[PDB]
Design a protein around this ligand. Structure first.
Ligand SMILES: Nc1ncnc2c1ncn2[C@@H]1O[C@H](COP(=O)(O)OP(=O)(O)OP(=O)(O)O)[C@@H](O)[C@H]1O
Ligand SMILES: Nc1ncnc2c1ncn2[C@@H]1O[C@H](COP(=O)(O)OP(=O)(O)OP(=O)(O)O)[C@@H](O)[C@H]1O
Ligand SMILES: [Mg+2]
Ligand SMILES: [Zn+2]
Ligand SMILES: [Zn+2]
Ligand SMILES: [Zn+2]
Lengths: 432, 216, 66, 660
């Protein structure tokens, strides 16, 4: 406790005395965040290194132990610059510019160390509840007690405080506080997989203000801590590794629910409206489609039209009208048909590229699976579910089996997928 | 020392699998049948060796019948100890072990029959001498094998007869199990008949210099 | 093994067979089969050297089936 | 102190106790260090010094020691290593690190321990013939990888803490197969709760694999046997599910409660802790050669490569060394060499990817040694896969979807084209094949990737593979009076993806038949199976290679591997007009009279072949000779697939470009 106090003091002085030019940036960010009810703080590591190298060295070697001290320093500063108290413990989000480590280069040498890596999100779980403030009572003497928990990896006391039993204590669920927990699954970048190897996956955990931030198929950059948890596999003394997320950078501006709101600052909106006023914007957009392909101007114009898309209408009688464009290219070999499909995948914010030979109706529309634990049936998305609000590029379309190809008829026009299997009867949206 | 084995053969009369009764348990017999399954050659523990945890005293030649048996009363001093031994796997002697499944011959099977089966144990130098699909004549001693799971195996791995399939309800309580023994506790011990074989017989190089050697 | 004159007789017989065929049924595989038959006939006589008589016998056996 | 003569006599009635004695373990270490420092081969160069020099350069963590070297001199240490691996390896790793710290002082900041990998153990066993006499000894076993658990961290120095006495226990070395069991306190004097001493500990990488018996080794019609192998750090992810491997390791035993409960007798479980791994997937040269990887080179070998790479006519000798015992068919050999060396893949601004591998097709009459050439290509290639006709399926040459027995989740499994990534896939009898199976390679031949959308899995794989295929014409034989399109059943989409097409015709010619027969008979004569003798064998086997091979095959394999790994030539200065004119002329002379589809896809093959010919010379820039040679090859591959009526006119019309 005689070192934790000095650590908290050092962090508070960093927050309150850092200045560049003529503005306390980290003091102003806290006040601006408090006004819009954002209880968090983002710190760049380069500033921390510049301020004092000892503070950075303390954090770099003991993250799980040091980070909560910075967490409480932030909320001590907040109550001073906001109040002369329903302020929960704040959150720290970190930014780093260090070298990125591949997933397959992570091993026993990197345990309990902060790392930076990139990958592809393949699945997002549901939100779960974790306790922070626990109200506790004993089964016999019946007196009140409290416990405070931080999520940086505790149990009820195996005793009694004031005969009572061994560990007699129950949780009073009312007057207890909880936060949000989410689990995500990662995968390697397809071009970084070694020779003859299948891609591997990893598990990550996010908390509080970093939940509902990514969607499956997204390419992201993750800053977090590489840790292990004992659980459960006949090996002796083996543990399972995972990553606790501290910072997320995502290419797609869309959040989990795609709020359909502007995420553009005025500095970019001005650029976009200036671009829109160009008298020859159509030619500029057309010339940007696959600049390494000669000719084929009409196909590129069609691709631009498909990328922008039409309008969608709803009528009083419940009718729905499609507002998306579908394009077919039936031609001779060697005419760059397959070099435009992979370009449309890159340019589109949301896009999936599939082959007709290696496909199936379940893989394209939706599948039904059985949970090993619960032993019930649930629905899992497919190619047309992932590529919602985007584009799906189906190559070798003529080689598709006749059973699999007919499953796309409803999704192409009615933009819905009807499943009536195993006691599950639902209709899912698919606008692609 | 070489653990020796004695192999008997050329018995006067041969038995079929359907002549196996409990009144020949312990006797020397010969049987005939068709092999339908063989297992791996596993090492069996023959002469165990342990070390007391505290004294570090060494015990050797601890016979084992059907389950992992550690010594009880400590060796030469004053030390008192009932358990907590450490097997010296290097000093202990091992032997080869194999289990083969056999069934009745095509002629001994009645007009309408579900073939009877048996478990034959090959040990020592007799491993791999019986191959599936062949017809072999075994000779040895008819023994009885108990259920060791309810005899208190040390590890928690047995977990008191963990099962994946449902046992027969018809023989639930019909299979006569003996109780009373302190090792069993309130449990019931059960037995089944198996065979232990000591001799096996079957009843159903372009080098010039080495070739000239064999011929008379 | 094959002797010096056996190789010349073998190549001569292969050339003659190829000439008589005319390439529709006769290939290198026929020459290899003739070598195999000569070696087998030599094994029959318990001799470690091959004589052109053996190649003549193998050639006759090949011709009898074509 | 003792002497090498004194290690012969043994005490304690056990070799392990004799080795672990303090006085013996000091002589053993000194003798091992003398062996490491002072060993020289016939040429007089210390090999282990060079290996140690390379170790630091590559930031390696392991050292490879041949068993034959340590058996030829200091044979007693070889016998001790053979019988007692565990105690010998601990000493030998320490002496290896001490020897390593004589070339790279302060190397302990990179790696803290040096591991030793034993090679070329004399006795090879099968999984069927393992018995109890092999317990606690070094063994060599071949098998086929089936399933792999994955990489998890494992404790190395285990610690415990007791609360009532607050005692901290000394570090314990974990067996990696048996949990550390401690119940007695040096201080508490009684039973106490034991913690794991959270944090402040050292981990290692751990993985587990299952080896089945290879189908070739298994007797026909019998069930295979399997065993479990534990792979420690530096050995994880080396072996892949589906490959065939050879493992040198230690055979151990352990007590299992379930095994005793089910069988009813005190039987024990066995497992192998892996020491050395050697790949044997596609390799038939395992009959000879020494080491763990025969495609790897040493410094003097690289210097010899650079010495022979500057001789004029290296390309001619490389071509002549392809399938030496086959007579003639020089165009097929040139195409095979060009495919083997390969081109250079490209990416333009990160949005336009261009393939860099050459595919070859052989269409010819029966009995023209196409399959033997395919077998030679399989033997020479670093990674090779073989398939034939109706024995391959749509998902057998592609990725398949299976339910994981443990996790019970749909997962992807490999195939023929994925097993040969950065390798060669060979397909014999390519015309006697279903269309649905044939059409599965359309994406892999050009885009060099595989896309799967099945059962909730939406993924794209990578297959950078080259295809050499052999086929038969319609009727079994080629009609030279007909165009190509009526001699085969394949259509344009699959014919365009091939770079080089070789039409093999059998014609009646007395002198040609005489020469071929003489060559074949001489070959049969040569191949008839009827200082140290083991080197007399090598010199006799080299004398036979002298006649028909300008360069030895073992040298050529490493040459090809080094060229593919290191060289990446470019196309800075070249004649664009000649290539443009050639492409335009080839396009014009196809629709007018021809049935060989020419598109933009054939323009890039000339550049790929030019880059391949540049690679053959170990040069970083493509010259004019290589481009001219590529143009000549492409033109000769097109002219000789015409009708006899127009071939003479087309050859004359195209002869101006190939003046040299
Ligand atoms: N107009 C063009 N400009 C530039 N490159 C081209 C053009 N047409 C074809 N190519 C090149 O041809 C090669 C093969 O093209 P691609 O793979 O797109 O063929 P495709 O139209 O999909 O054929 P297939 O019908 O056989 O599937 C690529 O390297 C591509 O860059
Ligand atoms: N110069 C040669 N030309 C042809 N065959 C040769 C030559 N030299 C030797 N042979 C032998 O001729 C035989 C015929 O070869 P092979 O079996 O490969 O013919 P293929 O018709 O191409 O085969 P497949 O139908 O299996 O593809 C082989 O045993 C081969 O070793
Ligand atoms: Mg295509
Ligand atoms: Zn109480
Ligand atoms: Zn004792
Ligand atoms: Zn204690």
């Amino acid at each position: 406790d005689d070192d934790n106090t000095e650590i908290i003091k050092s962090f508070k002085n960093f927050i309150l005395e850092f200045r560049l030019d003529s503005q306390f940036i980290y003091r102003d960010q806290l006040r601006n965040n408090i006004l819009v009810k954002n209880y968090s703080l983002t710190v760049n590591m380069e500033h921390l290194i510049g301020y004092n190298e000892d503070i950075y060295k303390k954090l770099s070697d003991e993250p799980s132990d040091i980070i909560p001290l910075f967490e409480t320093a932030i909320t001590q500063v907040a109550k001073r610059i906001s109040i002369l108290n329903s302020l929960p413990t704040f959150q720290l989000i970190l930014n780093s510019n260090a070298n990125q480590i591949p997933l397959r280069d992570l091993d026993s040498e990197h345990v309990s160390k902060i790392v930076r890596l990139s990958g592809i999100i393949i699945s997002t779980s549901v939100l779960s509840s974790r306790a922070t403030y626990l109200s506790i009572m004993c089964r016999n003497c019946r007196h009140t007690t409290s416990i405070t928990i931080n999520n940086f990896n505790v149990s009820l006391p195996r005793s009694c405080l004031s005969n009572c039993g061994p560990d007699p204590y129950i949780i009073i669920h009312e007057s207890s506080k909880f936060i949000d927990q989410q689990f995500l699954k990662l995968q390697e970048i397809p071009e970084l997989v070694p020779v003859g190897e299948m891609p591997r996956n990893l598990t990550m955990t996010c908390d509080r203000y970093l939940t509902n931030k990514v969607i499956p198929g997204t390419r992201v950059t993750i800053v977090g801590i590489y840790s292990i948890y004992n659980s459960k596999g006949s090996g002796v003394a083996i543990r399972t590794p995972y990553i606790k997320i501290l910072g997320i950078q995502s290419d797609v501006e869309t959040s989990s629910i795609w709020n359909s709101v502007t995420m553009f600052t005025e500095e970019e909106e001005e650029e976009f409206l200036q671009l829109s006023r160009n008298p020859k914007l159509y030619e500029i957009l057309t010339n940007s489609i696959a600049p390494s392909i000669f000719g084929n101007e009409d196909i590129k114009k069609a691709i631009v039209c498909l990328l922008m898309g039409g309008s969608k209408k709803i009528l009083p009688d419940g009718m729905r009208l499609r507002g998306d464009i579908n394009v077919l290219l039936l031609g001779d070999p060697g005419t760059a048909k397959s070099q435009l499909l992979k370009f449309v995948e890159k340019v589109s914010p949301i896009a999936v590229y599939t082959s007709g030979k290696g496909s199936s109706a379940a893989g394209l529309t939706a599948s039904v699976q059985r949970d090993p634990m619960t032993r019930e049936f649930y629905l899992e998305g497919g190619a047309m579910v992932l590529a919602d609000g985007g584009v799906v590029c189906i190559d070798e379309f003529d080689k598709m089996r006749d059973e699999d190809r007919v499953a796309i008829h409803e999704a192409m026009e009615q933009q819905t997928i009807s499943i009536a299997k195993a006691g599950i009867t639902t209709v899912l949206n698919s606008r692609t | 020392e070489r653990v020796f084995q004695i192999s008997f053969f050329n018995l006067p009369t041969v038995h079929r699998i359907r002549d196996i009764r409990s009144e020949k348990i312990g006797s020397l017999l010969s049987i005939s049948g068709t092999v339908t399954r063989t297992s791996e050659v596993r090492p069996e523990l023959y002469k165990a060796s342990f070390t007391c945890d505290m004294c570090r005293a060494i015990v050797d030649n601890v016979e084992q019948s059907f389950k992992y048996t550690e010594p009880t009363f400590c060796p030469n001093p004053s030390c008192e100890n009932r358990a907590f031994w450490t097997l010296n796997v290097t000093r202990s002697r091992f032997l080869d072990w194999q289990k083969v499944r056999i069934q009745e011959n095509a002629n001994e099977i009645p007009t309408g029959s579900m073939p009877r089966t048996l478990d034959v144990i090959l040990r020592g130098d007799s491993v791999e001498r019986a191959k599936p699909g062949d017809r072999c004549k075994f000779t040895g001693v008819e023994i009885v094998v108990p259920d060791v799971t309810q005899l208190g195996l040390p590890g928690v791995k047995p977990s008191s007869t963990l099962d994946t399939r449902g046992i027969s309800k018809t023989t639930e309580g019909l299979n006569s199990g003996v109780t009373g023994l302190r090792s069993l506790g309130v449990r019931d011990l059960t037995y089944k008949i198996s065979f232990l074989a000591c001799h096996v017989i079957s009843i159903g190089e372009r080098d010039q210099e080495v070739f000239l050697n064999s011929l008379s | 093994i094959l002797t010096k004159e056996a190789r010349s007789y073998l190549v001569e017989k292969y050339k003659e067979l190829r000439k008589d065929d005319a390439s529709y049924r006769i290939t290198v595989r026929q020459l290899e089969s003739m070598i195999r038959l000569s070696e087998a006939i030599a094994r029959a006589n318990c001799v470690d050297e091959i004589t052109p008589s053996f190649i003549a016998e193998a050639y006759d056996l090949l011709r009898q089936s074509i | 102190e003792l002497t090498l003569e004194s290690l012969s006599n043994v005490k304690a009635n056990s070799y392990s106790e004799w080795i672990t004695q303090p006085n013996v373990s000091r002589t053993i270490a000194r003798e091992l260090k003398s062996f490491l420092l002072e060993y020289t081969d016939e040429t007089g160069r210390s090999v282990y010094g060079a290996r140690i020099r390379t170790l630091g350069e590559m930031n390696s963590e392991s050292l490879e020691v041949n068993y034959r070297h340590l058996a030829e001199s200091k044979a007693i240490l070889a016998l001790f290593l053979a019988k007692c691996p565990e105690e010998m390896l601990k000493i030998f790793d320490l002496v290896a690190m001490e020897a390593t710290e004589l070339h790279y002082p302060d190397y302990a900041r990179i790696h803290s321990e040096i591991h030793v990998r034993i090679s070329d153990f004399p006795t090879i066993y099968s999984l069927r013939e393992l018995r109890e006499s092999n317990l606690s000894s070094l063994v060599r076993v071949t098998g086929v990888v089936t399933r792999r658990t994955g990489v998890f961290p494992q404790l190395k120095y285990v610690k415990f803490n007791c609360l009532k006495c607050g005692s901290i226990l000394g570090p314990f070395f974990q067996d990696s197969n048996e949990e550390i069991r401690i119940s007695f306190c040096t201080n508490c004097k009684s039973k106490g709760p034991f913690r794991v001493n959270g944090e402040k500990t050292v981990y290692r990488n751990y993985q587990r694999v299952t080896l089945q018996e290879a189908p070739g080794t298994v007797p026909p019609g019998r069930l295979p046997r399997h065993r479990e192998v534990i792979l420690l750090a530096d050995l994880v992810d080396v072996s892949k599910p589906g490959e065939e491997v050879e493992v040198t390791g230690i055979y151990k035993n352990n007590y299992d409660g379930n095994l005793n409960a089910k069988n009813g007798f005190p039987v024990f479980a066995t497992i192998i802790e892996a020491n050395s791994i050697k790949r044997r997937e596609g390799n038939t040269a395992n009959e000879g050669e020494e080491g763990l990887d025969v495609f790897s080179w040493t410094e003097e070998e690289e210097r010899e490569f650079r010495k022979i790479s500057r001789d004029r006519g290296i390309i001619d000798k490389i071509i002549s060394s392809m399938a030496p015992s086959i007579y003639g068919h020089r165009d097929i050999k040139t195409a095979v060499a060009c495919s083997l060396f390969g081109g250079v893949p490209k990416n333009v601004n990160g949005k336009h990817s261009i393939r860099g591998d050459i595919n070859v097709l052989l269409l010819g009459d029966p009995g023209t040694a196409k399959s033997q050439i395919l077998k030679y290509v399989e033997k020479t290639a670093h990674r090779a896969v073989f398939a034939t006709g109706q024995g391959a399926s749509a998902v057998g040459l592609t990725a398949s979807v299976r339910k994981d027995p443990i996790t019970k989740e749909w997962t992807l499994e490999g195939g023929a084209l994925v097993l040969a990534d950065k390798g060669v896939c060979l397909i014999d009898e390519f015309d006697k094949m279903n269309d649905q199976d044939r059409t599965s390679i359309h994406e892999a031949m050009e885009q060099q990737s595989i896309s799967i959308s099945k059962a909730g899995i939406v993924t794209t794989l990578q297959a950078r593979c080259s295809i050499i295929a052999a086929a038969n014409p319609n009727g079994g034989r080629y009609n030279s009076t007909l165009p190509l399109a009526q001699n085969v059943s394949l259509t344009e989409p699959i014919l365009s993806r091939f770079d080089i097409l070789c039409v093999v015709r059998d014609l009646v010619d007395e002198e040609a038949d005489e020469r071929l027969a003489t060559f074949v008979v001489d070959s049969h004569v040569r191949s008839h199976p009827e200082l140290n003798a083991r080197q007399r064998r090598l010199q006799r086997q080299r004398k036979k290679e002298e006649e028909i091979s300008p360069i030895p095959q073992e040298l050529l394999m490493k040459y090809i591997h080094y060229a593919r790994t290191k060289i990446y030539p470019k196309l800075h200065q070249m004649d664009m007009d000649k290539v443009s004119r050639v492409y335009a002329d080839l396009r014009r002379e196809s629709i007018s009279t021809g049935s060989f589809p020419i598109t933009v896809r054939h323009l890039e093959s000339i550049l790929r072949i030019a880059e391949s010919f540049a690679k053959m010379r170990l040069s970083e820039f493509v010259s004019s000779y290589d481009l001219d040679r590529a143009i000549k090859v492409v033109v000769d591959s097109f002219v000789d697939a015409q009708k006899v009526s127009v071939r003479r006119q087309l050859r004359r019309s195209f002869a101006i470009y190939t003046l040299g």
